[model samples]
Target: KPLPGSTGEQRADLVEIGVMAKFGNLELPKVTFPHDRHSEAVAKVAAPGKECATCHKNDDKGKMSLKFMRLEDTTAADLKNIYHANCIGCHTEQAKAGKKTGPQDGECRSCHNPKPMASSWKQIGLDKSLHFRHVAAKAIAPVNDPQKNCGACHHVYDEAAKKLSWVKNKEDSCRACHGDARVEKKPSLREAAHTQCITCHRSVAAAPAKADSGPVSCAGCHDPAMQAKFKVVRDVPRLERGQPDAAMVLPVVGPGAKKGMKGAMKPVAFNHKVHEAASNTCRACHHVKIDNCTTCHTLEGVKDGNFVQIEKAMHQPDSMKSCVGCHNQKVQAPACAGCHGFMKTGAKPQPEAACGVCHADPVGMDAKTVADGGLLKATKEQRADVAAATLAARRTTKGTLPADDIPEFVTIGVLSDKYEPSKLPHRKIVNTLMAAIGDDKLAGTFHTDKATVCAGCHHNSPASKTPPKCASCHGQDRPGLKAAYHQQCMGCHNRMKLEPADTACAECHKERA
Candidate 1:
């Protein structure tokens, strides 16, 4: 029999016992241990109050040691013996009692096999959707401050005091402290997560308080099917950690230098709330630490931000770490890609009007204040207040042109010869495109012109009511007028995977009889 709780489902928590290998080459291959599988077996063969304590021991402070079977940190040799004696001894005892058990002392090859068991563990992240579930759970309550809801999961170790403590508005990602591997007395990120999360889950499962106790079994979390079961709280309450709703993102002005707007670029009134709603986590934008971009990214570039200057940090079109790059990626979606895919994304410098879309003067910051550097020299609090005011003043419109102004249909007869002129549903198409980008904050904010929507087809012309005809730009050589019209229509349809196949000539225009 394959021990208790064994399933054909792929394992998640698997660890290789290789402490001895770290010191020197071992006599035998490292043991490929199935952690969750063993954990389930132990739970089934419970020794009353000693549930997890069957193998795990606690420190003096009643904190569970986030290690395998070893109670205390010892020499590599001693640690090696602990595993051999405990694992083999238990297996031997269980075998004599006619119970299914792991590899015994004589079965060295079985324990340390050349071919290890394959694991199907997938890395899972606690996104806002999952986080909100925990936040809403009644079982997980605030310990220190009742007001600080995030205090349960977030904590930091103070080097000065040499103790872990919770600090309000100072919560960061768990990886910020516990990295991939363990160091000294600190557990690895995996160890910490498994220990804390599983223990809590097990405790809650035993005595669930109204809501679901969450998953305790291995496949419950790491299995792809189980991950889909997690509730996605769409209208989840906004997480409040004293974070700003909006901020005036300005270029760094050195304290010693005279403050002026002459040399620096205009500030972007960043709406943090809108971004928060859009993003799954803060780490999407703020990768390293939850701080201002200027704190690490400098004018000349700094080692803290991997030597990336402020200019490149914001405008690197290919890097996901930049604003331009992130926006560029978003436009690749089928809804926007119909038009955007046609536009080239090379070394083209943005127009002056394009710059104003992002780098417009902050509403709350007066022209005089900016000129005199009063806004530049403002304190963090002052800047935050101004940013909040600027965000409050912000608004968006569906399109600049009135409904009646938009053409109902446009006769495409520029290259008319044999085929009848195509009657394009101008207003309907515009409305459909606009509807595709419905309530998208990024689209609303950046598409700031009266003729921005028209630019999709009417490219290479000034933004106005009457854009230059397509014949004005195309029809000279490579793709002549006929080819240009066909390519544009067919290419757009193909990119969007729209209905009415490109070859269906009758769909657009009926052939002349």
Candidate 2:
């Protein structure tokens, strides 16, 4: 999430700008903004500190920085020019008196391109640990007070009274009123905070009264060292926000949909409270905006909305916002990857068994009934009984594949079509396929033993084993003398998941011209 070229690790003494792209003839350079030196320089000035007011200024100073100004003005082109001109100007003046030195133009990329390993900025949550620190530092108080301590941040601008007041309500972040940009009278959040915090730290550090003086640079707060130094509140106190615990997500019927489609799908048990605790950001799932997904995505596809169907919206593999997609990412952990990797991609599970996993009720059973045998574990013994029952059910439907249905050998040639037909192992293929599925319960249940494997050759036909031969249904010249061989072997092999079946015409039938 860091800006391109940013390592996101500028904590204490560095400021990174951009990534090392095509550095042209000049090699990529690490542009280091010296925060510590600037901090010291600012400390020697008024009130013993450098503040945001000392450097950051907007043209109008009435709105946000990039928002109020043209966005192009804040891009690297303009900003880089500003840095080179003003920074060099100051450094040259300082060097004349033999005081100190800064970057010069010979180190071009050194100040333009950022280091590849720079760290991202860290955020100090205004939780109990930070609250305790502010109290210990005498910025607020050790104990909570309704009025006095609240005034530190909670300032209410009473429109009618024409003055700001403090209410005993909870403290909101400074970014609300004083956002990224400054208003005519109010400073930007960054400026307002920097002016107060840096000035106070400098004054205290100079006084030798304060035990701790916080950082005063982009690196100080944004860097790695200080970020790791803060004590993270593991047992965070519960904020008194009235939120729901759990809710079941029920699927609604769509327009022109049959009555049984909703029944086909199951309701999902969504644990709201647990999700809130697990996620660092709410936008992880509720991405479009806040609130529920149904707000924008209706059950039926709407013309006013983005032409996304409900099923695809929720189940698309590529989307991050959907439940299935998120769960798919979670289970992709290396531990789960081993077993799941064996499962064929773009494959569906047995409908009778898999339907109940996501569906609220299996076969419309009530909650009590489902709890008894429904969503709960099916014992090994019970599974055995079910298997036996399924086998019996399939046995009733089973019948012999009539012998006269197809030719035993399909005489097809591999060499040029001019040669004689190469006798095909047609029935042998059928028998070989039958042997492969002899023990598979799924194949047996869905099809008779003949029907199960026979489809490997006779695909696109109805559930039948004794299907017609290549030439019987497909005439010798009718299917063309060219593809008679390919139709028998490659066609069936491709359908049966033999990935090695190459489609190149020359791969199997080569003409040595």
Candidate 3:
């Protein structure tokens, strides 16, 4: 499973066997067993005919039971005796023959050391490329018919026969059957995968001339130092699980609704293909279960989805699962954060009118058109196609102003009593903003109108050729001209981590002679 603090891996090779409670709440930490190391050592030392079963055992039906010495632990005394007898006895015998071995009878502290094992293990997972590799391997070298051989790793419990069997074209995630939690007749995902994967890997390693078959040592897969050596297959084929390429996220209303129950919001055209390519697994977006977002999150809050409404599910600013939250993270990048940083923190108000960026005018061809096209009435493919074309047309590779039309400087003389009028580098600032977001697709897609760029400075008003003046909001009283200039200029400069001595007023405007 994924480590407590890390995000990458989903499986680990290091096994911590804490027999403390089984013995009697001992003071020592758990025995950190390098499973792959033990597996390899046993396979090497044992005679040609013998196998790992001398210590590890299987049931009469050939189902492996993960036990060290015996199948059951009767008592603390029995558990202590089992380890000491089997473990120490083997070491002592091996030492007597002048071979290398672990701690002897007198070395209690060596085995039961109080020091906790430092976690140096990484996680491993069976990604799409690895899954495809196994499928291809079966086709190339079939023990039986290729179709039936997939049963080796993929199987479902047959209740009537009381055995595990594979159904053709009916494979599901191992977690679907073996959940994370341990219960009667169901092993945990961790236990189930380890037992199956390690057993098969050991067998493959034992086969002649198959040394590079799979990982058979702890460090081979789990050691952080060795993780970089693992195969990372790029350009994996898209998983064919009957998922859509693009879809319209339209709100569903009840059949027997009131006269005014129709949804007022526009449908969002979601590109599932792009989202899938950006993620490692489907669970990244569809958490807990691989189902549609609206399956649980209804328009109104429901019990199944913990009373989370569709609006919050998609637009919650602080949640990673939310669409707005994820996009907020993207804008937090250094290039974009210079402007967005000045915005409020936590769950606060946003430019609500900018909702039209996603809920776009379906029929409107340009910025001048009214946004009453009603995207909900369109088909899924039509919505996606229109959305794509709209986004493509909105993108800009250069600044809106021509070379001669660009303003070189703008003199701020409104709050100029103690100092001369400040000549601001208007063109330079605009050029900087353009350079920062020149290749940014997110910025290009959202900054559709030319005046949308001006909204960064002249905010809290509609984007147009002429926005409301700063004095309109900050008059001679209240915020005043001086306070407004400082709040506007200094606030932005500080957020961008820019220099030019903001604290020294003379740097911006020289004192009157």
Candidate 4:
């Protein structure tokens, strides 16, 4: 039989059935289970309306068990006998009936495959678009309420009732509860998601009336090619989780705290709605539960948060969950990277001026908020007002240095002996950089000062129209003027994906006789 693992190719639908793991060191190789193949084969051969149950038994509630025939695993010896009896028994019966069959009793090697199928299983996530589709699906019925369909997939097991029930607005990500492995009662995330999704999809497909149903085949969900064809909703509406529109993320203060803005840094006006729209899932920022970061990450390190302090949680440039880290990631995008790309990596602190971009108040807000302790004592409504005002007054353009002051072009005379002076389009370069960063909200927010654009080239010195010459800093411990010019120009051109080819020698300067 052309069973799974018989060939030397990688497959997305292969599931390793490690039945021998519980018994200790495995004598035989673990079975490479191709569920899709089995499902298809059984459907073709089995009686009408009875296919999945051939292996997966159902409970009293008619909810199909994820296990094979049995409801649960008993003991190692018993489980081993059960697997042997079920798998070999069916194979032997199929062989007698002159049908395509897997390995029978004595064929130990065939069943316990030495060369298991190399898996190419892609982990799939229910992003906002997919979640919206499920919510909008006509076939998917809600567990409790008619208006809301989140209850269909999202549920919590009530210890008092001893049954699964959906709590509106109390829903959390599946990974929050169901971990990597199955516990006594709670199933693993893999098992729970697969069972719930497949069961629902299968039900929709098996209905007598014609209805649009999700894919039930292994390739349908796991295969990259099939996944690429899934219809995407670009403008997915914001998910309702009682999330604030805007939040002034202030410094954490414990009970009996007597701190003002003296020791504390200014509060960041976090636009939660804008961030939500930018992200694919809430899990991007929130872990475990969709709670405020400060809840787990206190001022000081706490055991619950793995001792990750609020400062590290927000400013740690390495972790993507942090504010600085997330902003650093956005800086890597090609559009914004033209200027910010040449700036420091996560290692160094951001330029002194850049700090004010997020920390500063709204255009017309009270200047005394921080100094007068208004920021510290502000109510939720007042904080919301501050955030709203800050977001509204975001700068859309680079600092307003008059065009008259900006040089049209500058000539490099150092290379005049060997080649004609490299005439740099100083004004056009600045304008081009600005144009490149067009309409990017992050860029607009951070590039508030006119000196910000100049920092790309005049990096060592403060933002100024009359900064020290590159020749001063160059030709020393740092790269020489010749190397500095070429490196800065070529590196940025390459990173920005500019035209006229970064390596094309004659593009910038001409050879002199």
- List of clashing residue pairs for candidate 3: none
Where does the lowest 10-residue lDDT sum fall in candidate 4? 254-263
- Rank by lDDT (best first): 4, 1, 3, 2
Clashes of each: 0, 19, 0, 1
Model 1, residue 232: distance off in Å is: 3.1
RMSD of 1: 4.2
Greater-lDDT candidate between 2 and 3: 3
State the lDDT of candidate 2 residue by residue for 1-513, as single tens digits. 767676443334555544323222324454666666664675565362324334544356332232211322444555556766777766777778676667665666555654444445565434455644554456443234632454554565777898876544434456546767778778787767766565556456666455566665665666667677776666544332343454434444444555344323544444466556655545567554345554455466555337566666677656667655555554344333322332321233332433333443323335564344333244534433433332233242233265566457765453435344456666665555555444433334335344444543454455553455444555443454346545555544554554464555444433443
Cα error, candidate 2, residue 220 (Å): 2.6
Ordered by TM-score, highest first, the candidates read: 4, 1, 3, 2
RMSD of each: 4.2, 14.7, 6.8, 3.7
Candidate models: Cα lDDT each: 0.76, 0.50, 0.68, 0.78
TM-score of each: 0.88, 0.44, 0.74, 0.90
lDDT tens readout by residue for model 1, 220-296: 88878789888787787787778888787777643334333244666777778888877777877888778889877
User: Per-residue lDDT of 142-211 in model 3, one digit per residue for the tens?
Assistant: 4335444565677667788988777544556776567777898788997787688777776776666564
At residue 273, what lDDT does model 3 achieve?
Answer: 78
lDDT of candidate 3 at residue 178, scale 0 to 100: 76
Please identify which of the two predictions, 2 or 3, would achieve the higher TM-score against the true structure.
3
Candidate 4, superposed: residue stretches over 4 Å from native: 1-8, 142-146, 157-163, 254-263, 361-382, 393-400, 499-502
Which TM-score value belongs to model 4?
A: 0.90
